[PDB]
């Protein structure tokens, strides 16, 4: 968007075409979010804190987006594991001389 | 004066009590080796035949 409406190839025409949506820029008339109410807690000066409605949250996700991975594992948990120890026990010497189903 | 001889008497008593327990503990371990010996004699004739 270089003083244009993003359907044109002034500089940075491409990567900003991948914009999520960000409703704020086309909805800055709604205002709204008048939803704090008179909480009567946070706070009192006995008068409650006067509320002024705010604007839209502005999108975010500035940091690099998740690359579809779950993670949440520990190197120590991965390294030893019970699986290797169980496998190197109550198993072995299986050559399939005859055909038989196994777990 | 007196506390000197008191120290000798206490130290002598305690070292006698120590040496008694020393010999008493010494004998039990030889007895233990002998008793586990016959208890473990089952193997090494079997486990040797194999």
């Amino acid at each position: 968007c270089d003083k244009y409406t993003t359907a044109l190839m002034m500089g940075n025409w491409y990567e900003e075409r991948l914009a999520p949506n960000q409703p704020f820029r086309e909805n800055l008339q709604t205002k709204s979010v008048r939803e704090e109410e008179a909480a009567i807690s946070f706070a009192s000066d006995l008068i409650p804190l006067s509320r002024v409605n705010r604007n839209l949250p502005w999108d975010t996700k500035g940091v690099i987006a998740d690359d579809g991975f779950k993670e949440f594992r520990s190197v120590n948990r991965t390294s030893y594991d019970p699986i290797n120890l169980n496998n190197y026990y109550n198993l072995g010497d299986c050559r399939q001389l005859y055909k038989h189903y196994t777990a | 004066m007196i506390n000197i001889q008191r120290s000798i008497k206490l130290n002598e008593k305690y070292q006698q009590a120590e040496q008694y327990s020393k010999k008493l503990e010494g004998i039990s371990r030889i007895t233990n080796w002998h008793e586990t010996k016959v208890k473990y004699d089952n193997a090494n004739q079997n486990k040797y035949a194999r």
Binding site: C1, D2, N12, Y14, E15, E16, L18, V33, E35, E36, A39, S41, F42, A43, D45, L49, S50, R51, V52, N53, R54, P57, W58, D59, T60, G62, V63, I64, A65, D66, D67, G68, F69, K70, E71, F72, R73, S74, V75, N76, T78 | -
Partner: protein, 430 residues
């Protein structure tokens, strides 16, 4: 268990704290309603570090927020995740500061500080074993720069042994928005040096440069800068909340980074940062992480790191990697850039490893550095201060609230001394 409390003041401090708490909530899987809906069990093993538990099973942050004007609090409550903070930790005035240091540090700051001191005292004593305090604030403003630093002094008087972190958004002359910048900046930097254990400088136009060049977006907003600062702040204390191969706490960072008690100003950076158009086209390797990390442009400060020599550096790698590759890369970057590291200290870069990277990411690097390049910022602040103080401009507004030019003279002399015996080691040789 070695929990830390959070304190925020001023407009920028409140906004930064709100975004940081949103980021931490997303990381730990706590919903805006305070009910846990995470996935892995590791999210609860050290959940008590940043949150307290209340009846009903909901977790609430231990953050205290403070200001002289209620508009910022009105905003933070109405914003997302505004229901997390307990109502008791909101303390405010009714008049505001108006970017005047004396207003926020002498009369209104003093008359208000009792309640916030009581709140921080009860919060600190409620938890089992303290570990330290962290602050997020500004020095170009009134209420932050004055009342926050008054609180800094007060709490340091009462807890001499605990570690202290400050995240100061020090304003720069390029993005200028107030003419009384030099006054309150100089006074706050004077008061901070004798109390703050670690200071972390952040620069607005540096963040703008990062967003323009690396993230490559036309129309950034304070949300993005707040998010970057929040990510860096969260990456600072990853080891305290997640298992690692070489754990390092705040005291370990201070010991590894502080050569002398008055040399405690640091400049930070976060990696990896890439544009949305090139997200899929880059590999995930420790060499790439360190190459992006050591780049001078990636830093979060106006100071050019290549204009001085590093005294000490620290990196907090996250994810599952190999210490072999990490440390060999550290060795290589220390050897090919021997000119930029002061010679009389060997192996002046420290590494730590944590097993849990940020959600959706694999290798992340948080870098903190103590170097001599920070001198230039204080130098420009000093030249502005002297050029604008020699004529006694805007002076009467300060002098009309019990303030005397003697403290201004002392502050400028002390800042000049900091510059002097901060750059001495640049030319000092073994």
């Amino acid at each position: 268990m070695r929990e830390i409390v959070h304190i925020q003041g001023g407009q920028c401090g409140n906004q930064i704290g709100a975004k940081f708490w949103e980021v931490i909530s997303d990381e730990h899987g706590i919903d805006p309603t305070g009910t846990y809906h995470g996935d892995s069990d590791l999210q609860l093993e050290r959940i008590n570090v940043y949150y307290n538990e209340a009846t009903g099973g909901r977790y609430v942050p231990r953050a205290i927020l403070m200001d002289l004007e209620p508009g910022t609090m009105d905003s933070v409550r109405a914003g997302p995740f505004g229901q997390l903070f307990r109502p008791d930790n909101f303390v405010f005035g009714q008049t505001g500061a108006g970017n005047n240091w004396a207003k926020g540090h002498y009369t209104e700051g003093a008359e208000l500080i009792d309640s916030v001191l009581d709140v921080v005292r009860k919060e600190a004593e409620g938890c089992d074993c303290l570990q330290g305090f962290q602050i997020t604030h500004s020095l170009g403003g009134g209420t932050g720069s004055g009342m926050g630093t008054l609180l800094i002094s007060k709490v340091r008087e009462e807890y001499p042994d605990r570690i202290m972190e400050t995240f100061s958004v020090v304003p720069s002359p390029k993005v200028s928005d107030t003419v009384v910048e030099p006054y309150n900046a100089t006074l706050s930097v004077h008061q901070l040096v004798e109390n703050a254990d670690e200071c972390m400088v952040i620069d607005n136009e540096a963040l703008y440069d990062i967003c323009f060049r690396t993230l490559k977006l036309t129309t950034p907003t304070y949300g993005d800068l707040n998010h970057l600062v929040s990510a860096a702040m969260s990456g600072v204390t990853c080891c305290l909340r997640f298992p690692g191969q070489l754990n390092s706490d705040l005291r370990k960072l201070a010991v590894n980074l502080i050569p002398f008690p008055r040399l405690h100003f640091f400049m930070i950076g976060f990696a990896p940062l890439t544009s949305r158009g090139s997200q899929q086209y880059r590999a995930l390797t420790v060499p790439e992480l360190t190459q992006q990390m050591f780049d001078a442009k990636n830093m979060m400060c106006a100071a050019d790191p290549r204009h001085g020599r590093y005294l000490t550096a620290s990196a907090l790698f996250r994810g599952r990697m190999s210490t072999k590759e990490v440390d060999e890369q550290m060795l290589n970057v220390q050897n090919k850039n021997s000119s930029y590291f002061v010679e009389w200290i060997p192996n002046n870069i420290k590494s730590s490893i944590c097993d849990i990277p940020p959600k959706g990411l694999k290798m992340a690097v948080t870098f903190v550095g103590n170097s001599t390049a920070i001198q230039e910022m204080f130098k420009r602040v000093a030249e502005q201060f002297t050029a604008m103080f020699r004529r006694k401009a805007f002076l009467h507004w300060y002098t009309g609230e019990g303030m005397d030019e003697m403290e201004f003279t002392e502050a400028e002399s002390n800042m000049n001394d900091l510059v002097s015996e901060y750059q001495q080691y640049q030319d000092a040789t073994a």
